[PDB]
Amino acid sequence: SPQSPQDDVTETPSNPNSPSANLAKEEQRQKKKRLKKRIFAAVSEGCVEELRELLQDLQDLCRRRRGLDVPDFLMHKLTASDTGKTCLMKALLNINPNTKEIVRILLAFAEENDILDRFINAEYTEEAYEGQTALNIAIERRQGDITAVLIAAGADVNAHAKGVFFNPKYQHEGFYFGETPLALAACTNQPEIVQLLMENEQTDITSQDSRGNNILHALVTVAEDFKTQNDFVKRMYDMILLRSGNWELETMRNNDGLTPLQLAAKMGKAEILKYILSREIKEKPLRSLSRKFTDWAYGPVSSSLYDLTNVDTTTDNSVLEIIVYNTNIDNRHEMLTLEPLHTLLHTKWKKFAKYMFFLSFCFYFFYNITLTLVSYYRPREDEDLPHPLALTHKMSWLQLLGRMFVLIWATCISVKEGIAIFLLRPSDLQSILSDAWFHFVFFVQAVLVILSVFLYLFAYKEYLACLVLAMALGWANMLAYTRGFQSMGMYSVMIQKVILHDVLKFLFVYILFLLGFGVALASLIEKCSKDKKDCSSYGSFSDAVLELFKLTIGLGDLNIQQNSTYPILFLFLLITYVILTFVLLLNMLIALMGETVENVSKESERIWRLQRARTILEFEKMLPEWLRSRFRMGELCKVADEDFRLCLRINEVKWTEWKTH
Template sequence: MAAFRKAIDCFLNRLKNPTSPTQSASKDSASDKVGLGGRQKNFNNVFEVKNRGTESPLFKAARENDVETLKNLIQEKNVDPYERGSVGETVLHVAALYNSKEAAIILLNAFPFLIDEPIDCEMYKGEYALSFAACIGNEQIVKMIVAHGAPLNAQDKQGNTVFHMLVLHPNKSMACRMYNFISSLISKEKIEYLENITNKDGLTPMKLSAFEGDVAMFSHFMKKRKQIYWAFGPVSSTLYDLTGIDTWGDELSVLDILCSSKKKEARKLLKITPVKEVLHQKWTNYGFKYFLLWTALYFLYTIIFTVCCVYRPLTPAGPNGDNITIMVPKPLNEAYATAEDFARLAGEILTVVGAILILVTEIPRLIHIGPAKYFGNTVTGGPFHITMIVYACFVLITMILRVLNHEWETVIMAYALISAWCNVLYFARGFKLLGPLCIMIQKMIFGDLMRFCYVLIIVIIGFGAGFDVHFQALDPNTYLYFRDFTITIFTLFQLMMGLTELPGPPDIKIPDIIIVLYMVYMCFGFVLLLNLFIALMGDTHYRVVSERKSLWKAQIAATTLLLERRLPAWLWPRAGIPGDLLGLNVEKWYLRVEERSDYQKARKKSENEEKENVTHPRKNRSAYRWKLIHKNISKSLKKNEDACDMTTL
């Protein structure tokens, strides 16, 4: 899709000096004329033949709109209408590209089958002449091709129709105008059929605009779906068709696309009606309530797991249990004897069941959408899905080690506790106070901290090896913090964080080379790397602070869809109003939105105009003079009222 769009951009940037714009295009601004067709003098790297001397006369006549030559060539019996150009284009593609209307008419009358011939080129993925004419913006040629029976449902190698091509067009105003023009040439039923055709990615034209984060095209689609139900004064009740927008019965709806997209532009579509209203209705009516319940249950579940770990059955170490200073877990046959033990057993069973439910809900989703999309998207909670799955695995491993009475049970249990409480941060997204802060933490941990740790590991290993080489020649009992390589690395980490000083006995002189290594390490590790990490976090905060609110709202939307997918239908009714209750299509659902005309902006605009007239009275002298008269009349009336009040007193 990206390569195709790049080719379209290249294709449109090559268009120069349009000479015959259509009547509707002449009303637009100069910026809109970039996408319009015209006779092209030099099409450098796309359709220009390497050697003009070998260009086919048929293609040259179509390019130059030479009607007489074209008629003479068609009358010859040796002409080949299936002839391809340098990049696999037909002669009709060339006529559509260069806005050769008369040549296109002659070609369609002589060879009507050319409208079914796609371009044979990897760059343009098998586009038809109709798509070329539509992307150029020549309404006359498009109308003529459609009148000759061009298949509007024809798809290229990527499954894109002419409507998909217009969505990908960089000139949005021209694309919207051409979309409306093609729609005016066919029936309403045909339009609905064409707008429901999906490409190989499963995207309709409307969903493709959401996938691309195209605000202009998506707003255009929403206006087409808008129906005024009733209006009274400035208030109107508007109905929006939710087909393809709502998640009900659609695995790849617009809401799913927007919530799973990593593009900043896609998050802007969450503010467009009716997407904003649908998400607000889902979240306020059901999502927030179920999210609070989910948060409370997980918090209670984590507390139960923590209590079971803290009060696990322990016994003194030793053959006869005589070493009371060291405690070890009890064997399985001795761990459950009292009432407290059986209460703890109930909590442990609940913990294991919860871990199994987490795996049952997370793994199928992981397999369905793939690890890259599942773990790599901050909006959908990517890193927290990793900790969820890791926590569940740790709990099951702890259960197995408990049965085997293995000494590693305590180690795995500690990691399970850490991951369980880290997952609590996931539920901060549902609250306005903590949600944006949680986004900032995610960006810093999985962005700056990961890069810092990568450099830190390399530095500590290098300096750790240098320190260890010198301390190997010294007494390990004297320098306990440098007795082996692993302890040396841990000591260097403490030194870099400023948690300790260079350890060693004060009455024994440290070799000079170690002092030199220590000074170099502190300058590089503590002064440079640590301050660089702080600067990176400051830069991340500066970048994210402007978009954290939009990211948080996107997280709310993703959480709403997650709850809707996982809860049964009888707990989460469908949003909107069925069409049969409104007297519309019985197979569709609609969302009713009450809209109010914004008179305040118009009033503010008129006030600004009045201020401008007062500031520059020569621009509107009559209005300025009337303003002075009105002001003097008001003052005189006020004086008369004050005089009457004094008389009364």
């Protein structure tokens, strides 16, 4: 939210006398700052004939010069003031109708010397914009005609302006076009400059950022979450790719090891990825970049073959891997209903996950029941404080059928949920607590069990209490297998979301009343009996809390004024309390409840698909070495070589309906 340019912003009208104080060299009232600054303003205005004479004395001052120091001196004369900026910078920061005319005069000046190629390729010694040259500024101010002269000048079109200006944050303090002169035109919608630059033979394309980024990674960090009114970002994108002609250009990773597809999922520019994945451009020496092999399309049916390169979980960092396990995406449901991403998901549950979810459900269902009968019919209240495993096969066989099953599946889930403590969970009180909250409550469940068995060997009079809280928490985790059905998968989010949303807010307020009114209630008893008459009354501070909270829920009684010492202010405080909490605040929280619920009841399918998509990779994570049948359509060529890329299969869409007569 702050900007913080942190220094020397650039091009200020307010100009001190700091650099010219070091170079005195004065002959007439100031020899050089009256020469240097007058160059600037004549550039800054555009007055030509004034500038013609100022360049004449620049030759005249550099006429008197020692051995071969005349080119280097004028650089120290004209540039390297505080930052390294030039007159060509000042020629190109502003704009005026004299600009093209003064530049070609200014171009002809240092052509008389031998440093103009060095002079055109100056860059900032300034730390902030380190590497910024005069080319990009013309590209910034949209002067291809100047740039045509600048291309005719012979300047490096492959510079790297790796200064501070591109940010360590995301979308602030200066943008990330990616330090290259080529991507600047493409990012800023000048396709003619894109063509003309790429037509030049100096033009590398495949060079990389400091981040290791090509030109396409810049295009990832541009577009929106939606269709704008005819953006250029998509039509630039293929326009490079039409000129690219080689499949390798998207095989490039970055410093983070990101395919441009892979980054496009990571940033979440969802609509671009739809255009990325489709690529149905038909041209016989150009199908190598194509990704949509339609052959059998007969009206509303449509045959499909997709590219499927980094999409399945057969490598690290799949595009289905990254879309699910990411935080901070708004429209995460978008990209999911995209056809090869949707179908490969939907087949996989049909082929792999329907069987595994039903199995992992059924074991955990017996697990509470096995916990139940060892907790309700148990004769641990039948005076068996030492050594409960006696002879006669320990009083029954079915005690062993219960006790053995629990001990295995406690540590089975425990090592299973020990894997939840792995590299995940970046944040604390965000979506990871709205997603991995089950893994906390799964894990602490079985730890209570083993501790209770550890308390069964060491009978320490709290063995049974640990079991009880282990058991009711077990049925709470039993609710976590309510994310598959539509009619239940919407349901467990709402107690996960809104209760953490509202009820945490409310009990940072309601306690503050209850801490206040309670001492007010508890002070007005004057101790009066010491529990011989005020037994039907209040008492210590804890004893009124569980009555006011009882009054909060709508329970309790009121005609208890027998020891109050002033039995109206006792009542006036009480009636004010009841009219505060139950009339208003309890009803206040339900009004905030039902509005948030109504938001979630609208967003039903978006959370329902995603939880299915969440667990299916987790089950696919639990699959060693035996995966040949659990694959998808290998070994496919296009026509010519061996198998270029394995694909997937056909689709249908019933919108042959249109109007063309």
